């Protein structure tokens, strides 16, 4: 699997990659929150959609 990581070395050749890495490290505050909120919304709707549909054909 890991033999894919070498693809990233395009970073030097490509502005987009480094500039994206930075626009992500800067907004790394809201992505932790997004992961969190998604995790909670998923658990909520998973429990619901389970019990509202656990017993069927």
The residues of the shown chain that bind other proteins, judged by CB under 8 A, are: 43, 46-47, 50
Q: Which is nearer to other proteins, 27 or 43 (CB)?
A: 43
Q: Which is nearer to other proteins, 22 or 50 (CB)?
A: 50
DSSP per-residue string spanning the chain: -GGGGGGGGGGTT-HHHHHHHHHHHHTHHHHHHHHHHHHHHHHHHHHHHHHTTSS--
For residue 26, the minimal CB distance to other proteins (Å) is 25
Q: Which is nearer to other proteins, 19 or 43 (CB)?
A: 43
């Amino acid at each position: 699997v890991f033999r894919v990581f070498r693809i990233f070395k395009f970073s030097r050749h490509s502005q987009g990659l480094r500039i994206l890495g930075y626009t992500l490290k800067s907004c790394a505050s809201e992505l932790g929150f997004l992961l969190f909120s998604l995790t909670m919304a998923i658990i909520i709707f998973a429990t619901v959609m389970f019990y509202a549909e656990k017993g069927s054909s």
